[PDB]
């Protein structure tokens, strides 16, 4: 058959440096008369995949010279010189010479930037929601780096583990940071049996957790 392996899954790289994605096929892509139909695609977060290189090393119109393809037989390589913030996304290689045409698993290019601490904000349930008998407590941990971050929820001193749903964004081409939201959902009834609601952000940028919270103490 036709199998395509892409290495590695994720690839960290500094601005100005080079990166190399590897793509391996399961047979000689020696067409039948000449070229090999090996292709490279990039899909930037929130967008559609777009053609970077076709026929092993053919740069598609509009694609910077920084990008280059090569290889032969079973090993193909996409190279990216002087990396820019905009180049972040998920790179895919494609095999179309054989049946069926197939896509490699993909590779996510990550951009190494300066360690940055998250900006934390907490929000109590709206009045609209409380009327519906529900209560979600939202906490935003915005613009930080590296991606690894941990958020712990605490109710009146004690930590709450259930009812919490987290979500991370993709790396932002803008400032190369990541953002995340942690949502604690409770029924209006239970919610009103406590006063202290807290979310703590634990990140590499500090020895102690960034802590935000509010009390249902009158205001």
């Amino acid at each position: 058959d036709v199998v395509v392996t892409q290495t590695p899954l994720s690839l960290p790289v500094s601005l100005g440096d080079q990166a190399s994605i590897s793509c391996r096929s399961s047979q000689s892509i020696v067409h039948s008369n000449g070229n090999s139909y090996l292709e490279w695609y990039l899909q930037k977060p929130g967008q559609s995949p777009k053609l970077l290189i076709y026929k092993v090393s053919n740069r598609f119109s509009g694609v910077p010279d920084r990008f280059s393809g090569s290889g032969s037989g079973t090993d193909f390589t996409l190279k990216i010189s002087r990396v820019e913030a905009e180049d972040l996304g998920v790179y895919y290689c494609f095999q179309g010479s054989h049946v069926p045409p197939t896509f490699g698993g993909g590779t996510k290019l990550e951009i190494k930037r300066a360690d940055a601490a998250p900006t934390v904000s907490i929000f109590p349930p709206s009045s609209e929601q409380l009327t519906s008998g529900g209560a979600s407590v939202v906490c935003f941990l915005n613009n930080f780096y590296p991606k690894d971050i941990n958020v712990k929820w605490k109710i009146d001193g004690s930590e709450r583990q259930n009812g919490v749903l987290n979500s991370w964004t993709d790396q932002d081409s803008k400032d190369s940071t990541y953002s995340m939201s942690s949502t604690l959902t409770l029924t209006k009834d239970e919610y009103e049996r406590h006063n202290s609601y807290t979310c703590e952000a634990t990140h590499k940028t500090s020895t102690s957790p960034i802590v935000k919270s509010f009390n249902r103490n009158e205001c």
């Binding site: 139909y37 559609s48 995949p49 598609f60 494609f94 349930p125 979600s136 935003f140 915005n142």
Partner: protein, 220 residues
């Protein structure tokens, strides 16, 4: 300028059928080969079907028998008939036109989301996220909108209808009990608020829902 526009996406029951459209423009519709490539949840990409200039049609194996590609030469429409839908067919479907011959998918559409489930269409409830206090806020203030309990995806969020483009974080939706939930934060200069009005406008095509929720400072 080559341009492709998909549509016909939406919620479908298991065992159901659906026929997608790709409106082509900017090129001689019958000169190039056209294709459908879908993307599952895990960012996985999979070729689904192709129609070559000659009229021949090729298909993968996970699809043969259920999917049918064809084109309306005169109207410039590429279609993909999908039958015997299974939850595994849930994905983002894109149509793309080869560059020339079969050398590379040079032009892609924005895609149309196909969801296969027994679950029912449900409108999202939009709740404002405003600073309950002000213990020590800087020259920047963060506001947001909670959009919960809706189905199926997608959902669209925006601020002041595009005006507030920068400084916005709209987090990916998390599923829980056949219901998606998502948030979106917007950070603007603390001086321009409550001074200026900040509103998030949510839209959920599947339920023809369109809502705007103004963000008011929370009173005691």
């Amino acid at each position: 300028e080559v341009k492709l526009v998909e549509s016909g996406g939406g919620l479908v029951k298991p065992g159901g059928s659906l026929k997608l459209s790709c409106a082509a423009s900017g090129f001689t519709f019958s000169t190039y080969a056209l294709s459908w490539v879908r993307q599952t949840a895990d960012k996985r990409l999979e070729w689904v079907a192709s129609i070559v200039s000659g009229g021949n049609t090729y298909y993968s194996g996970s699809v043969k028998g259920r999917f049918t590609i064809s084109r309306d030469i005169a109207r410039n429409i590429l279609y993909l008939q999908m039958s015997s839908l299974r939850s595994e067919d849930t994905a983002m479907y894109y149509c793309a036109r080869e560059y020339y011959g079969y050398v590379g998918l040079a032009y892609w559409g924005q895609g149309t989301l196909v969801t296969v489930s027994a679950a029912k269409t449900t409108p999202p409830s939009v709740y404002p996220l405003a600073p309950g206090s002000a213990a020590q806020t800087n020259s920047m203030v963060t506001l947001g909108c909670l959009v919960k309990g809706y189905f199926p995806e997608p959902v669209t969020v925006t601020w002041n209808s595009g005006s507030l483009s920068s400084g916005v974080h709209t987090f990916p939706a998390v599923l829980q009990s056949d219901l998606y939930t998502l948030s979106s934060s917007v950070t603007v200069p603390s001086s321009t608020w409550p001074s200026e009005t900040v509103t998030c406008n949510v839209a959920h095509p599947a339920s023809s829902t369109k809502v705007d929720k103004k963000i008011v400072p929370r009173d005691c």
